[PDB]
Amino acid sequence: PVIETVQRAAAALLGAVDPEAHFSDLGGDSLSALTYSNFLHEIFQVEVPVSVIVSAANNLRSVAAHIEKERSSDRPTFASVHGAGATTIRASDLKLEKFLDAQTLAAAPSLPRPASEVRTVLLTGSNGWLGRFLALAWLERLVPQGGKVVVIVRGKDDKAAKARLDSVFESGDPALLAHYEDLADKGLEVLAGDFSDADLGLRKADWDRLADEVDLIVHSGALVNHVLPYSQLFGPNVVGTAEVAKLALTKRLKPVTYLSTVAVAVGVEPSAFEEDGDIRDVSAVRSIDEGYANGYGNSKWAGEVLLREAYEHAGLPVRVFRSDMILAHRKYTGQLNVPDQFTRLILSLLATGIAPKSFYQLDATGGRQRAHYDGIPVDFTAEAITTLGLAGSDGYHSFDVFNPHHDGVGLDEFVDWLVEAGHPISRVDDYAEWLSRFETSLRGLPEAQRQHSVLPLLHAFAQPAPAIDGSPFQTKNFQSSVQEAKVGAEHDIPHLDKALIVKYAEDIKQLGLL
Ligand SMILES: *P(=O)(O)OCC(C)(C)[C@@H](O)C(=O)NCCC(=O)NCCS
């Protein structure tokens, strides 16, 4: 019986279990979920994706049910789109005929054009890091106009989904909580769902209603994971983007804001990475391999291609925003992206108390060189994306949301600033000696701190990074649009400063991550 194998495999893996238990409640995470996924895949000879195992809507019973369903026999797959066993993927593989039904595609070019006034916005990924502040930014604009923000969140039912979303605004900041509750009760609608499933995992009546009522879609949701392979991210990030596009191409046209990533530039020559070019020409072929964030980069690229196809077929207006590292909120306390690579690094440096002399390549004489960290704080990013996205009722344009300043503000300045603020971090001169001692210290930390540390991403720091000031990639469409729209206090992309970095240490203490 399938549930028995599911139970026993979980017990053996995690050192324990009830069929109503959730994998994460038993000590599971996204990486032990990969081990679990591969184990069950080999036993039952069916796909058992990580997403099925880790979804907040699913328990072990749900995993067993998924296996039973697959064993007795229609969604797009890696195999049906790219060909089974393929180690390279092409933009030409990703055609809309393989994701959307013929009737939707035939009717799409003649659909009514976008509404002149945006009153209702559908937002994906709202309980995520960036999405929560995109939700807030839309609520601030729309509530005073009698408008609505609808949000799809994973959960067992609408009540559980709402609870998950509410909890991300509880971080020890009274002003944040008050502001959220004020706006949410007036303008927020929360639906349990899943954008990798048909009809976005919704009740049919809700999906039909959204096809009629929604004026604009903000697609911020994705499985953001730097270790998982492309096959595991295909469902949430590629099929998911196609499901969002389907809604945008039903009943009437709905402009789409799509979140992407600097990782789509991997494998492309910086001079050839055209910020506002056609992504199908810029990156026509990509390889699947063991490189850092390869699967993630590929998955987000694939979504861009599909949306570009949707624009060319139906004139669907799209704005893509390729993010760098989206850093902490500069006002709201306890608000930082806890699982991101940067937060993990800062936490690890504070916890271990040791940093290298430089994170970057030394010069010929062994001296520290000028370097830049490609990061933008979320409060700026959320305002920029919302403003520029609202202006995107026509055409297709892309933005590189990277920090282009040749300001010499990088990881070594951040360590200096933490030391000047009173945090004991000693400098180890040899990078390879630091990296070795850093790893040892990390393994000696208590389990909670070690899991929150940079340990599972340490392979990104195998070599010192190149000493680059500014960004290698084009940023001029983003920078100039941000200057013209006069965004924030800067009327420009911000510089990262001492206040922001010291706030990381304060937020880490406030959340009890230590
Ligand atoms: P799992 O969810 O336990 O996976 C652990 C992880 C370290 C692999 C995962 O948290 C991860 O990939 N973190 C980095 C996320 C990140 O840096 N996001 C923002 C830049 S795209």
From Swiss-Prot:
Coiled coil: none
Source organism: Segniliparus rugosus (strain ATCC BAA-974 / DSM 45345 / CCUG 50838 / CIP 108380 / JCM 13579 / CDC 945)
The Carrier domain, residue ranges: 1-71
Domain of life: Bacteria
Chain sites annotated for binding NADP(+): 127-130, 154, 164, 194-195, 220-222, 260, 296, 300, 323
Family the entry assigns: Belongs to the ATP-dependent AMP-binding enzyme family. Carboxylic acid reductase subfamily.
Name this protein carries in UniProt: Carboxylic acid reductase
Domain notes: The N-terminal domain likely catalyzes substrate activation by formation of an initial acyl-AMP intermediate, the central region contains the phosphopantetheine attachment site, and the C-terminal domain catalyzes the reduction by NADPH of the intermediate thioester formed from the attack of the phosphopantetheine thiol at the carbonyl carbon of acyl-AMP. Large-scale domain motions occur between the adenylation and thiolation states. Phosphopantetheine binding alters the orientation of a key Asp, resulting in a productive orientation of the bound nicotinamide.
Upper classification of the organism: Bacteria, Bacillati, Actinomycetota, Actinomycetes, Mycobacteriales
Main function: Catalyzes the ATP- and NADPH-dependent reduction of carboxylic acids to the corresponding aldehydes. Catalyzes the reduction of a very wide range of carboxylic acids, including benzoic acids, heterocyclic, phenylacetic, phenylpropanoic and fatty acid substrates.
Segment of the intact protein contained: 669 to 1188 of 1188
Designated gene of the protein: car
Residues found modified as O-(pantetheine 4'-phosphoryl)serine: S30
